[PDB]
Amino acid sequence: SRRFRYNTKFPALVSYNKLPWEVVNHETPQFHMHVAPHYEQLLTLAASSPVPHIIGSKHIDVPREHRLRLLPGMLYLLDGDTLPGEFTINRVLDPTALQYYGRLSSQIVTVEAVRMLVPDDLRLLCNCITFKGPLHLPVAPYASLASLRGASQGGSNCFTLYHFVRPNRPPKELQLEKYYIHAPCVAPLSEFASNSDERGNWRPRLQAPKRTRRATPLPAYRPPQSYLMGLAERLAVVPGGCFGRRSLMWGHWF
């Protein structure tokens, strides 16, 4: 019969695209939590190795019928703050949403403006971030960002990132995992190469110096005076509640 084809184990489940607690809304600061560490690792890649289609001369001109099909998941950098047409400009002024670009604005290019572009059909977002040059990271001459005027120079320095996403999807949609190639930075090794004049000025240390004095002792351990929560090595708490292993307890009160 129809009842005796398979068993009832592992039935069909409702997908996460139709559950509101699994779908990240773009009007919330949780949209910029998932998508901001993907930008700071892409700009680290684009400053160290040539990525093919991360920098264009214009916006990509797909037709209006193929706009929703081809554009989400695509990223490119342009020079200057020029926004695509048929979009409504919503500038992100929330400090709860702008705080997730803190590492991006400090250790890399300074974030000037973050804009969300919502179209007339309300189905294709575009996260526009305006950076102001120059980069705080050293840029390789063969890298992609060396082909950018705002990135190489130190209105003329501004360049914009464009990331197209769909509005109400689970946060696995707004992922950029094809840009996690870890290209090395040869800035500490450019000093000793043949292209540098500092190659004969450094002195090698082949042996350790003779230590007449031992290390400075730590100050005297004062035990705490407050009520502690208990032994963290059996409450399954990580060594400070932050990181480490529970089997290797360290950095707590004892």
Partner: protein
Amino acid sequence: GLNGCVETGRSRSEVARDLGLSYTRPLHENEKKQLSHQAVYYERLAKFKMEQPEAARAMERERFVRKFSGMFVKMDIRSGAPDFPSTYRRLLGTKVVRWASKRHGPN
């Protein structure tokens, strides 16, 4: 194609299927009607779902409400039993009045 395979455990029909042989008794007209009317109801029901959406949607919604709100929708050993009036036969007298009998087949 009259002998099953002892090694693979295939049936008498599957060995003849893998050899391209046809062993089928000459069917009567009702036995051909049983194998001929399987696609007719599918072509009827799919045409109904394409042609009358406002009625097929209401029928499917009422069927889903009747399925979802049922009391015995939890997959259990009671709901997973093949013959419920035969395995649980002491409930048919004093507890369950749906089945009036505990024997419906050869078991």
